[PDB]
Design an enzyme around this catalytic site. Structure first.
Site, PDB file in Angstrom:
ATOM      1  N   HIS A 145      -3.477   7.326  -6.290  1.00 60.80           N
ATOM      2  CA  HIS A 145      -4.152   7.093  -5.156  1.00 60.80           C
ATOM      3  C   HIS A 145      -2.660   6.821  -4.176  1.00 60.80           C
ATOM      4  CE1 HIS A 145      -3.298   3.032  -5.631  1.00 60.80           C
ATOM      5  NE2 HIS A 145      -4.179   2.849  -6.675  1.00 60.80           N
ATOM      6  N   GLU A 171       7.010   5.083  -9.514  1.00 55.33           N
ATOM      7  CA  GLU A 171       7.472   4.935 -10.799  1.00 55.33           C
ATOM      8  C   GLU A 171       7.620   6.351 -11.459  1.00 55.33           C
ATOM      9  OE1 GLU A 171       4.469   4.019  -9.745  1.00 55.33           O
ATOM     10  OE2 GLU A 171       4.361   1.632  -9.746  1.00 55.33           O
TER      11      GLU A 171
END
Ligand SMILES: *[Se]c1ccccc1C(=O)Nc1ccccc1
Ligand SMILES: *[Se]c1ccccc1C(=O)Nc1ccccc1
EC number: 2.3.3.16
Lengths: 373, 369
Positions: free
Chosen positions: B249, B302
């Site tokens: 998201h 990430e």
């Protein structure tokens, strides 16, 4: 304009963060109950610490704490708290402790019990010191309870009644709600980390002086009253010098702390040599403080009688904070297991009240900074 | 009758502090350190030591000092365990007093001493015990602590690899209130020594639920190198039920500023995986948004952290420690801020357990001495 919640309390004072089924510190009613069972009932019928550990974690007297496996302590730093905090954290690789996410409740309960009794073993070895040979397992294996094994590993040939003193203190200090150390363990456990990492973090939070609960230094005052002879004169002199009476102050419960009353009763029946002087000091300290400021409601801190009980069991003062940590492992493990079942990460919010956007050239000392220009 | 005060567990959305350190402006799509955009800091190649001082002190001038010689005394097989245990033992040997008994200048000096100590411990642990240590004379040839970290670990570091770590650590220095940062503040609120606070925060970072740790995308990135079509491979991963790693998201408005900064560093330093990675990013984004046209789907930071860290020859098992090293700047800043606040963190709980009952009425009482 940057605003703040109307009932903003820095430090989350009075904010409900959890609902727990473990224990009820009934401060209005002046009682402490572990899973609905009064601590007075537990300590009067002489229920050992290992069984109370099971009661808090499991909710019933199901399976007591097992004995610790042979594991010499690998950390000798000169601080007992540091030795056990670092020692527990390294249990995960050697023992293969998986993250709390990847294990079921039964595995977590066994891991918590295995490490909880290892923390007690680490403290006993650290307390004994490196300049003394270790106690053979055979002498330790002769003992029947976890508390007896702890004292035997540390003292070699402990007095049987000193073992009874620790059981009374450890049960009374097993769990007292949502303190800073218990809160620390739940926050770490809420990330899914292994139980060893959560217990080690809670040990660090307990080391803080402002945490509350560590036995205060009262032996210098108790020694003086024994030598002088008049308790009222000694407490008046300490107050007149601008100092604070150790072990006394504002009330925590509505009245006498149930843990304090339990510990004083234990010192009487067990035959504490300091009990007679300690009682005289208590009444003198209360009378002097309740008269100088007749408005405050002042009672005796549990840390006053914890020092007397621990000193009776021949616990050095610098070791007293570690004794508190050992008993609190029961409450820590119970909350860690409950947090795992709760299954939600703990992450509060913060309101920014700092400077707005500013170029790096507008920051002090920018000329000293080396850059590609 | 026992009722809660219209709450949710986990303190979600509850304000615990006010801070001056950094502002993760999620609605504006920008991250600022003391009002300074991280994009400005990285574009001018400000080193990690300077950013550490900016967060903790609020201004430059006294950066992170070099680490003193101290062979790591803990070898447990886990880098996180080594640094977490090692930092806690710094207090007895260095005479670290509790935070209650020292002033701000002493606390700041102790935080800097331990913060650069943690980087050295991670570098030594990564290098392993089956290899001799890098001599101090070679380390002193370096000019920055990031270069000193790479030299102590690898020995002969590529200059491009050092720049990659410096860019990543700046973006991972501080991201507001999180579980590890909260843990450091809670421990500091008890007055304990700064070493105990840092050691506890490392354990909080260990948890998988913390988030922000570099994503596991290497098997997928290696896969597109074989097939050569990013579109074909991603569709297969969704089809058989697995989740596309490194994508999810929205966190900021549209794009995480750290993700854009890290991606720009990959192309600037000539990362070999860059061409494949950008192809996977577009293929993953397009299909995820097409399958769910309602949810805002954006690239996780990430994902690019793994690309940059892997470029610097950082193994997958080491990446969580790399994130720990960068976040030490934020933890130190919040510990000092908590010291000045001087208020213990102590929440409350409501009892919903069994009522008052005798010990004999509890199951299993007959098996008790
Ligand atoms: Se310890 C020991 C050693 C030999 C025999 C018996 C014990 C023992 O369990 N003592 C004890 C335990 C609990 C409470 C008081 C005394
Ligand atoms: Se490290 C080292 C060793 C010998 C000569 C120069 C360096 C050095 O400073 N490398 C470097 C530091 C920071 C950024 C890029 C490169």
């Amino acid at each position: 304009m940057t605003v703040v919640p109307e009932n903003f309390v820095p430090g989350l004072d009075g904010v409900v963060a959890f609902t727990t089924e473990i224990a009820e510190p009934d401060k209005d009613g002046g009682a402490l109950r572990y899973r609905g069972v009064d601590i007075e009932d537990l300590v009067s019928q002489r229920v050992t610490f290992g069984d109370v550990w099971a009661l808090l974690v499991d909710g019933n007297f199901g399976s007591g704490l097992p004995p610790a496996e042979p594991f010499p302590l690998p950390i000798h730093s000169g601080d007992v708290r540091v030795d056990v905090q670092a020692g527990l954290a390294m249990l995960a690789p050697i023992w293969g402790y998986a993250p709390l996410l990847d294990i079921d409740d039964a595995t977590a309960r066994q891991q918590l019990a295995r490490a909880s009794v290892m923390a007690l073993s680490y403290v006993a070895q650290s307390a004994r010191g490196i300049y003394q040979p270790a106690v053979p397992q055979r002498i330790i294996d002769e003992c029947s309870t976890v508390t007896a094994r702890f004292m035997t590993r540390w003292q070699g040939e402990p007095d049987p009644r000193h073992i009874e003193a620790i059981d009374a203190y450890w049960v009374s200090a097993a769990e007292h709600g949502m303190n800073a150390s218990t809160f620390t363990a739940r926050v770490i456990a809420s990330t899914g980390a292994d139980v060893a990492a959560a217990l080690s973090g809670a040990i660090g939070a307990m080391s803080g002086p402002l945490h509350g609960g560590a036995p205060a230094r009262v032996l210098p005052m108790l020694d003086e009253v024994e030598r002088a002879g008049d308790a009222r004169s000694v407490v008046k002199g300490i107050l007149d010098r601008g100092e604070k009476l150790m072990g006394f102050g504002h009330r925590v419960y509505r009245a006498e702390d149930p843990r304090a009353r339990v510990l004083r009763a234990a010192a009487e029946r067990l035959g504490a040599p300091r009990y007679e002087v300690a009682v005289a000091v208590e009444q003198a300290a209360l009378s002097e403080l309740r008269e100088r400021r007749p408005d405050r409601a002042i009672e005796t801190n549990v840390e006053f009688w914890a020092a007397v009980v621990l000193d009776f069991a021949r616990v050095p003062a610098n070791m007293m904070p570690a004794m508190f940590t050992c008993g609190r492992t029961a409450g820590w493990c119970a909350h860690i297991l409950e947090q795992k079942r709760l299954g939600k990460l703990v992450r509060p919010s913060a309101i920014y009240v700092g400077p707005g956007p500013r170029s790096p050239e507008s920051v002090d000392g920018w000329e000293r900074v080396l850059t590609t220009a």
